[PDB]
Design an enzyme around this catalytic site. Structure first.
Site, PDB file in Angstrom:
ATOM      1  N   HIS B  41      36.432  54.604  48.441  1.00  9.80           N
ATOM      2  CA  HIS B  41      36.786  55.375  47.250  1.00  9.80           C
ATOM      3  C   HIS B  41      35.960  54.968  46.035  1.00  9.80           C
ATOM      4  CE1 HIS B  41      39.291  52.388  45.135  1.00  9.80           C
ATOM      5  NE2 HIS B  41      39.953  52.161  46.254  1.00  9.80           N
ATOM      6  N   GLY B 143      40.109  47.586  38.887  1.00  7.71           N
ATOM      7  CA  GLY B 143      38.819  47.006  39.176  1.00  7.71           C
ATOM      8  C   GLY B 143      38.813  45.957  40.269  1.00  7.71           C
ATOM      9  N   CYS B 145      39.686  46.377  43.358  1.00  9.01           N
ATOM     10  CA  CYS B 145      39.450  46.943  44.672  1.00  9.01           C
ATOM     11  C   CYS B 145      38.169  46.367  45.260  1.00  9.01           C
ATOM     12  CB  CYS B 145      39.366  48.465  44.598  1.00  9.01           C
ATOM     13  SG  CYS B 145      40.934  49.207  44.074  1.00  9.01           S
TER      14      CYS B 145
END
Lengths: 305, 305
Positions: B41, B143, B145
């Site tokens: 993503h 942030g 991820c």
């Protein structure tokens, strides 16, 4: 979101850990530039530790009696010196992995990360607080002496703790990196009173702010209090007295949440007088005092190094 | 002695973290050999995440649309591929800091360390468990991820988790390093049921053994139980059923302490039915289930890496 007891990334310290052997005793040392730092009781046998005369014991040692091993790299010791309760071994090679670093003496109630080591090799990392009575509640087995505690600010490691002793009560004592013990303790295997501990009130309040930020709000209540009123409760429950300096340090968290510090004090008062009634706060059934206000701001804002 | 929730030393993983930017989105990637791994993503905007068609979104991307930065080193992307929910970016340089490593898919109830990162830079390290319902209760801000979870066995890093999502309930979901989600979750900003969680019974028992080893013994009692009797209580209190495989994994701790597993079960039964009466165990007022039997043996024996 979420709130965890989080240690600093340990890689910069991992590259500094070495094994120090003197005769029969092996423990950990910290290799920075061309100096290795370690507890002076590396020169002691089992029996020495009951009543050691460190000056006399060190005189019987020469440079070549200290074996220092960085992984498989052997370091050459070219000088030795005792500073307070630490030994400083000058070696002929500067550690190529030396980070930017400072030595600091922390205050009671401040937190730091410990890199637990055995035989110069890292085993794990955890966060803890210096207790008001200058002990720490760590995880230290035989051979962990010389493990260090530290904080990191962007690229600079501030070393604040070197592990030396387990008291007969099971709590831990050590020094700053100039070899001065925190608290009244000495590096001798004897009974040593730690003295009454207290709960770090400003840290509990910080953690309550962290709880509100993360959605735990059930403890927010109808009351307020005064600094003097709250301190009467604090003394009854063996909490440190809250000062205006503490209120000021909590300013940013009060601003973010909109909850005045003295209103959070009234919540804490009610929790102290009434308990938690079998509820939890940030996954805990007791009031947590090992997060400082800076720790909470760091984790709630994603500060990085 | 002492018992702490301890993370693995993070240095070997720190050297693998990079920043990945695709258009407007930045998160963390893991650089091993000449491949960077990150959540797919990264190719999504804010609006895309409500219902993304990842195949169509990736087709509009070319190698030069992925900016990968290792500290200040810029990597050159020479290929890209989607595997399940992860993107694999081939780069022209092998990471000189690549550790010995494996990719593993862990089972529910196992533990691992998380290195929380923002913008490719490490901020902290903590230990957690994969819940029976395949969520984790972490500390992950915007942030984070691409941050990874791992275990270390001597010199080998076993990567088991990559962070992808925060569910609306505040718990965290992610994948193995082949991009397969743990649990029923998908990488879409939608309501997603996690399903009933349970307490990891074999971990609670391990932690009770750790408590006895460290001198907390007040919960040891007069009773014993059967596996079937205990499991009737376990179901009432939403604990995982205990199996013989679990009993076997606790063998070494039973041997060290001299306390039969079913006797420790009878202690746990009484704690479940009667609570703790305002006492504590290893500093906790609740039953802790984030230590595995191997975790307890590691910490009680000083295993190093």
């Amino acid at each position: 979101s979420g709130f965890r007891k989080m240690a600093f990334p340990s890689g910069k310290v991992e590259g500094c850990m070495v094994q120090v052997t003197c005769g029969t005793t092996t423990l950990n040392g910290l290799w920075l530039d061309d100096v290795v730092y370690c507890p002076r009781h590396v020169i002691c046998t089992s029996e020495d530790m009951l009543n050691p005369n460190y000056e006399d014991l060190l005189i019987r040692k020469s440079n070549h009696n200290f074996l220092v091993q960085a992984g498989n790299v052997q370091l050459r010791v070219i000088g030795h010196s005792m500073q307070n309760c630490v030994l400083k071994l000058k070696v002929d090679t500067a550690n190529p992995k030396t980070p930017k670093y400072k030595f600091v003496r922390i205050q009671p109630g401040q937190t730091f990360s410990v890199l637990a080591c055995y035989n110069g090799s890292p085993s794990g990392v955890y966060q803890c607080a210096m207790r008001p009575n200058f002990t720490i509640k760590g995880s230290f087995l035989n051979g962990s002496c010389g493990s260090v505690g530290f904080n990191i600010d962007y690229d600079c490691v501030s070393f604040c703790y070197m592990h030396h002793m387990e008291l007969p009560t099971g709590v831990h004592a050590g020094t700053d990196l100039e070899g001065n013990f925190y608290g009244p303790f000495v590096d001798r295997q004897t009974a040593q009173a730690a003295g009454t501990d207290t709960t770090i009130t400003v840290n509990v309040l910080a953690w309550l702010y962290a709880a509100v930020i993360n959605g735990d709000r059930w403890f927010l209540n109808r009351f307020t209090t005064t600094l003097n009123d709250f301190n009467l409760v604090a003394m009854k429950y063996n909490y440190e007295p809250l000062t205006q300096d503490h209120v000021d340090i909590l300013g940013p968290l009060s601003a973010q949440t909109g909850i005045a510090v003295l209103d959070m004090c009234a919540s804490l008062k009610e929790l102290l007088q009434n308990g938690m009634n079998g509820r939890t706060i940030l996954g805990s059934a007791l009031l947590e005092d090992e997060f400082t206000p800076f720790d909470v701001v760091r984790q709630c804002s994603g500060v990085t190094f």
